[PDB]
Structure 1
């Protein structure tokens, strides 16, 4: 009899239902066996981790690595360091990573792990001492051809460092065992720009499809939210591609372009610099260049969607639930034909249905086409693939070579949605398929077809 894993049970249940709400089990009833086999993890290793504080007292924590599926590649997925962390939670995140990884087209499996060690308040020494203990046991079960972890909440560049360093010390091997590594020791160019650029390349593959190769980002006006990695870099891509960034935002208010024009790459770098020193957009409007009142209007308390006027593309990249149902409709009245999430769960369920019913009711390129986070924002995941690719050759690509390849990888991710929705939720003649509905299913179907080829089920 199972224990209570409510975080996982729901993630399980969300998948089942979307597979049932589709033609997948009419055309292949035998894929209920796939769901049954796939949702038991292949392997879970739990381990005590004993580490020492700056005072010398003993401290105990629980370390986990859920290694869910490896049919399409080595186990791949993040490490989480947070006092909430437990099996139930890492399964929920392992499970989903199978299918979000699978959706990219790369040869990557699915897993997640970490510990309930709480890095808040700890010194860098304490972190280093814990990482060293964590990796002393974890080194046994990973490797560049077996399991390739990465970062997540409370594990970034610094901890990836400590973990890589101790893997090496024990294993006597330099290899792509971890991703999100430093640039001099097997890290990848276009990592910081990965999620920003990846969203833009994805939407570009949507445009060409809907417009039969006739239109692109060029000429288009693009309203964007947020000002961190994700917005900055999606903004820079629109610009290089001859488009128009017409809005940025932070949590206190929106900076939008007055009339026709865009942000320039010079201006975006200013906004970055102030986001490094953690100053809010209202603080830079009093000086040049943002003081120009003919170009910029700063609106306080406001998300940008209602203030941008006529827009063609919409890119939330700030937080979750930053587009409501009333903002979805205003976006539709404003002529916006495309929308993707740079941020995870960026659009509310209300707004999602609003985009999907509108798509449903408008044949072709009169529709507003929506892309969920799990596909459009997988540029971070894609570039991890390319880290390992380069790590395998022990060689650094150029920033042009990674960038170009990143785009191709968002095409495969685009294709996987497009083709799976055309097959399992066939729209009417004229109508665009559902990239959301396609993208919740494609991960499962690639992985289950794989599992059957390999005798994991029958």
Structure 2
């Protein structure tokens, strides 16, 4: 199924639940600027290979667009457009002065050396310089892209820009040595934890000593479990990676689980825990469940058997819309996927602010500001959910589209 068409259908479903003019919907259904460029690099053997690069800016009514760059062999122009459309709503729901943007290169980075990767980043910057900038379009790290490529890209942009302005702020996710920001490694987990705490407050639940289950034990899942156990004082009872899963009644130690996974390549055979599967984790009876792994793990097949009371969609769209309806019917409070993991883009916004201002904050200030933003966004989404009697995902979509529509109307782009 085409990603851009799914995004458009999602937008139309959201518009069904709110009062928006037809011209505004038609404007929002089309990216405002799409740039496709050729990216030529010199290979180590001396030959020149040309790659295809994309840079889609869906909307910039609220401010400069924001979005990461993907380096995937199966990259398409439609995926870029859909992800830029999603990024628009993601930055709108958390109330940032940002638009929607996305970039990508059709390349397999596993077969590229470090020098070839640097050449690719510099050539991409040289190609898309005319449509990016500190106040025009701020790229970010994404799949198969790391802060090292961000630093290379920033260096190339500063070289082209002749240091005439805040070249640090042209791109986020940079190393701390060059315009980096603190708390960029646990941004998603921190935002998810804040949203879970706000959900527990809204449901009247004391999380102290409660049970949490985390599916996926990568960067987001591990840090989410660790932060939950530390800050929320809850009991982490079960985790699971792509290989397998483990379950413990009393509770596990996430640091020990990560050490075991590093030692043996998987979380399986952990002492004091019973080896289980991802599925058995899904129907595990816990107060909070945080799927932080491969998307679409909750479908119609297993929606009715979910015993979780709070489902924090840390991953990108892990719940099927029919599964969404089934979970809403049972009275389970869900958190929209693009609202729960909005901590990363919020911390990227903080990094951009620090780069623009030339003044950098500490870990405590970043954590406090992230807490404030996540708490306010979640409370607004929940209030819309309760007032309009619609789904949480639908409420978040309504909030984001309403903000973007108001920004468009204030600019005079749409007269209705």
Task: Return the index of the structure with the highest Cα Rg.
Answer: 1
Q: 1:273 aligns with which of 253, 259, 268?
A: 259
Distance 1:346-1:10 versus aligned 2 partners, 3 A rule: closer
Q: Is the 8 A contact 1:321 1:345 kept in 2?
A: yes
- Name the structure 1 match of 2:93: 103
Q: Is the 8 A contact 1:227 1:275 kept in 2?
A: no
Count of residues in correspondence between the two structures: 411
Please list the CA deviations of residues 117-156 of structure 1 after superposition, one character each: whole Å capped at 9, or x if unmatched.
3323111111111212111122232111111011222322
Please list the CA deviations of residues 182-220 of structure 1 after superposition, one character each: whole Å capped at 9, or x if unmatched.
112122222121111211210211221222xxx442232
Q: 1:14 aligns with which of 10, 17, 22?
A: 10
Distance in 1 (alpha carbons) for counterparts of 2:365 and 2:206: 22
Tell me, yes or no, if structure 1 residue 177 matches structure 2 residue 170: yes
Tell me, yes or no, if structure 1 residue 386 matches structure 2 residue 350: yes
Q: 2:397 aligns with which of 434, 437, 440?
A: 440
Distance 1:274-1:143 versus aligned 2 partners, 3 A rule: farther
Given the two structures, how large is their TM-score scaled by the length of structure 1? 0.84
Equivalent positions of 1:244-255 (< 5 A) are 244-255=235-246
Distance 1:147-1:358 versus aligned 2 partners, 3 A rule: same
What secondary structure sits across from 1:41 in the alignment?
coil
Distance in 1 (alpha carbons) for counterparts of 2:277 and 2:131: 51
Distance in 1 (alpha carbons) for counterparts of 2:296 and 2:156: 40
Distance 1:123-1:340 versus aligned 2 partners, 3 A rule: same
1:318 deviation in Å? 2.6
1:325 deviation in Å? 4.5
Please list the CA deviations of residues 25-50 of structure 1 after superposition, one character each: whole Å capped at 9, or x if unmatched.
3xx5xx22111122232222322222
Aligned-residue RMSD, C-alpha: 2.2
Equivalent positions of 1:441-456 (< 5 A) are 441-456=398-413
What secondary structure sits across from 1:65 in the alignment?
strand
1:421 deviation in Å? 3.1
Distance in 1 (alpha carbons) for counterparts of 2:152 and 2:314: 29
87-96 vs 441-450, greater mean Cα deviation: 87-96
Distance in 2 (alpha carbons) for counterparts of 1:144 and 1:276: 39
What secondary structure sits across from 2:413 in the alignment?
coil
Q: Is the 8 A contact 1:18 1:441 kept in 2?
A: yes
Unaligned runs of 5+ in 2: none
Distance in 1 (alpha carbons) for counterparts of 2:358 and 2:209: 41
Q: Is the 8 A contact 1:52 1:58 kept in 2?
A: yes
Tell me, yes or no, if structure 1 residue 262 matches structure 2 residue 270: no
Distance in 1 (alpha carbons) for counterparts of 2:381 and 2:50: 44
- Name the structure 1 match of 2:76: 86
Equivalent positions of 1:201-220 (< 5 A) are 201-211=194-204, 215-220=205-210
